[PDB]
Write a protein that binds this DNA or RNA. Structure first.
Ligand SMILES: [Zn+2]
Lengths: 126, 24, 98, 213, 61
RNA sequence: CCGGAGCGAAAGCGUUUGCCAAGAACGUUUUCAUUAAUCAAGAACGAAAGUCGGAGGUUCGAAGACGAUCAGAUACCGUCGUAGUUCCGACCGUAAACGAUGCCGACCCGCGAUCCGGCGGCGUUUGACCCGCCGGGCAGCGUUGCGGGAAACCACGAGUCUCUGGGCUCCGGGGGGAGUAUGGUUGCAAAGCUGAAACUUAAAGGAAUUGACGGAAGGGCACCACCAGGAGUG
RNA sequence: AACGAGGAAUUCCCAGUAAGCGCAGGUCAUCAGCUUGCGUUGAUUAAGUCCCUGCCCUUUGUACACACCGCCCGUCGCUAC
């Protein structure tokens, strides 16, 4: 089995699935939900991430990638740490599309102590 | 908001000082 | 009138605590007044853990969990349904809900 | 126009022979086009692999970064670059109602390998303990951090990079600190969490073949 | 992949937004394995037979 | 990790290590021997913003531009960004600087925890944990239906108040006018401290209760709701 | 003549019920494309849910109490002190 590393930037307003080699140096294939939907409002929807990892499996099989290490990633830093809605739809679409998954681990950029986050002391009053 | 009654009062006192300063 | 004996925070014997930021609104909330919520959930959902299990190249691999420490302000901890408005006598129950 | 993957050839990444397996996977890079040789990119890559992918009967939360340093015959050779625990297992060891004493040293081995090893230990609640909180005093915190910084340097200074790696794959350093701190306050999860390599010495291929031999 | 058949063994309760789905656990008949639960739509009682096209997922709610 | 835990007169204070001189509590058959308590006048300190003079300006972000929404947004939302936010010195002395509760002292309930020190007791473990006790410290619960209060609530008393007197300082006298005017005074300025009157007004306000309401939460109900469809309207 | 099972939407109903069919009464000198009844033929689907839209109860908040069709703030404009 040709092991790989799959970087899933599961955040809000967009969902990224980035498949690279074992070192993460060369990008084998990467797509976004906006590449499959007409309106950018449906980017964070799990249906867009469902179509994203689907065609990725073909590009992984065409080049020879069979297994993919899951590297789940949220926005991190000052912003939220919980991954977006595409964290599970893209992960399930990867295994269901005839691939292999192994050694799942999430890498979210959590800071020891960040700077002042966007929005004042009163917070985003939406 | 009682704080803006204090904001407008400090703004009115500051204008009364400029009127009283030009009468020196 | 004073609604809570502790004024809605855990400041006893102190004059000022370090304010932290919320999660869903990014509001400066004191450390003792923050609505702590230690979320520990699996990386893969229970509805999709079986698809990842059969696709695992190993025999028995326990899926890790998402250990997230969330902070909520009073205005958001209620909108997000983390905490509710309890009765006058029910507010004194400091026991965590089961 | 043309698919860039047509000029990409696969290289089998390897590892030091002190582990249980050398085959770590496959990498990819474009072939030599002009002056830019394909070796100009496969000599600086880093592979972050876990211990269960390196060892056969060890834990899976200890990840090891292996930087590439030489390519010999369509295969890419690697060497130690840095250890780091998983994000999830690190957030699980930290618990409430107990003191957390961290420590970090930056000392080099017998060779010019400057290593920065990070160790983290937590105190342990006694079995017959009725008190909820197990809090050691501030001076009791210092004594625990003293032994944590002293053993990280002593065990890494009397050996070269090859031997300390074999002492790094298990928790050999973490188990002795808990026994040392027990004389003052019992600890629970004494663990070396991260190893950072800041500066790299003038590498000799003679010592590389001695490890991989 | 070969098709597998199963008999309804127990009804759990109504699921779905409108309550049209009925969570019902099934059990294979030919080979005694994978006594997994499935989601059924319509009137379901004890003793029915569901021709499961797959045997991989639970699909709770 | 970090807690209704500690420390400090407060504001305030949590990465490592080092340096520097303080502090409570406890220990004491040490020492001094009433040297006190509270304190007009006077002074140190005092979050943040602001101000003057340098460095640095990541992020955030007054102002400001622009993007959206609306009948209209000079806002919330979004991009960007000055001052500012960061550090250095001199100012400013203002906060819901709140425990909205001065300091000292006596007396006046109980229990379980917690913090530091001391004391004596089966044990476990090479101080840790266990059972207590004495002294202060942050607090909590229970009873306040041994009291107090308009009540909410109060043993960090808000108890020992017509059965009124332990000591002392500050301060309030219906709501507005108004922390305004004026004078003095401080300040680079913004402003700080001190502080009126004319005039106007029969209420303002506190606590609690029942209704109503919420764009609050929870639960429940009906083919004038939907699901599943079936008729027909448009 | 338009109307080829009919736009976005929308009404009704789960048993002799919906619907189809026709009758009779009320209105009425003359009249039923209406309505109140009546019998006739006779199903589809469902023996459910807060999903949606309407609804009461409890908790909670209030400066509301001829009660959210509530109350109330400032600028501007008029007059008087
Ligand atoms: Zn907040």
């Amino acid at each position: 089995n040709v092991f790989g590393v799959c970087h899933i930037f599961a955040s809000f307003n967009d969902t990224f699935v980035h498949v690279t080699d074992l070192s993460g140096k060369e990008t084998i294939c990467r797509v976004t939900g906006g590449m499959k939907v007409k309106a950018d409002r449906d980017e964070s929807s799990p249906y867009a991430a469902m179509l994203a990892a689907q065609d990725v499996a073909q590009k992984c099989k065409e080049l020879g990638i069979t297994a993919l290490h899951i590297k789940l990633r949220a926005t991190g830093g000052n912003r939220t740490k919980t991954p977006g809605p595409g964290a599970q739809s893209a992960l399930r679409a990867l295994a269901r599309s005839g691939m292999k998954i192994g050694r799942i681990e999430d890498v979210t950029p959590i800071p020891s102590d960040s700077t002042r986050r966007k929005g004042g002391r009163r917070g985003r009053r939406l | 908001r009682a704080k803006w009654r204090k904001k407008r009062m400090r703004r009115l006192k500051r204008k009364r000082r400029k009127m009283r300063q030009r009468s020196k | 009138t004073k609604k809570r004996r502790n004024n809605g925070r855990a400041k006893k014997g102190r004059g000022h605590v370090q304010p932290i930021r919320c999660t869903n609104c990014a509001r400066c909330v004191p450390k003792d007044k923050a609505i702590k919520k230690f979320v520990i959930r699996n990386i893969v959902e229970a509805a999709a853990v079986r698809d990842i299990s059969e696709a695992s190249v190993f025999d028995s691999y326990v899926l890790p969990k998402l250990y997230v420490k969330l902070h909520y302000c009073v205005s958001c901890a209620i909108h997000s349904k983390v905490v509710r408005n309890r009765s006058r006598e029910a507010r004194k129950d400091r026991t965590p809900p089961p | 126009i043309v698919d860039p993957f047509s000029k990409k050839d696969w290289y089998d990444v390897k590892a030091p022979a002190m582990f249980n397996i050398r085959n770590l996977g496959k990498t990819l890079v474009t072939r030599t086009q002009g002056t830019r040789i394909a070796s100009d990119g496969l000599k600086g890559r880093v592979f972050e692999v876990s211990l269960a992918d390196l060892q056969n009967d060890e834990v899976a939360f200890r990840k090891f970064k292996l930087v590439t340093e030489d390519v010999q015959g369509k295969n890419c050779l690697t060497n130690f670059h840095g250890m780091d625990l998983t994000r999830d297992k690190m957030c699980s060891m930290v618990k409430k109602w107990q003191t957390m004493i961290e420590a970090h040293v930056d000392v080099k081995t017998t060779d010019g390998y400057l290593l920065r090893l990070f160790c983290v230990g937590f105190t342990k609640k006694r079995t017959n303990q009725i008190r909820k909180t197990s809090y050691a005093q501030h001076q009791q915190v210092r004594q625990i951090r003293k032994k944590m910084m002293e053993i990280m340097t002593r065990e890494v200074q009397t050996n070269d990079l090859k031997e300390v790696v074999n002492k790094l794959i298990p928790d050999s350093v973490g188990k002795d600190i808990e026994k040392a701190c027990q004389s003052i306050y019992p600890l629970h999860d004494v663990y070396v969490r991260k190893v950072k390599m800041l500066k790299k010495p003038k590498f000799e291929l003679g010592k590389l073949m001695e490890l991989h031999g | 992949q070969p098709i597998k058949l199963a008999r309804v063994t127990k009804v759990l309760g109504r699921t779905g937004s409108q309550g049209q789905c009925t969570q019902v656990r099934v059990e294979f008949m030919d080979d005694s394995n994978r006594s997994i639960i499935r989601n059924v739509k319509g009137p379901v009682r004890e003793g029915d037979v569901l021709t499961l096209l797959e045997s991989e997922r639970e699909a709770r709610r």
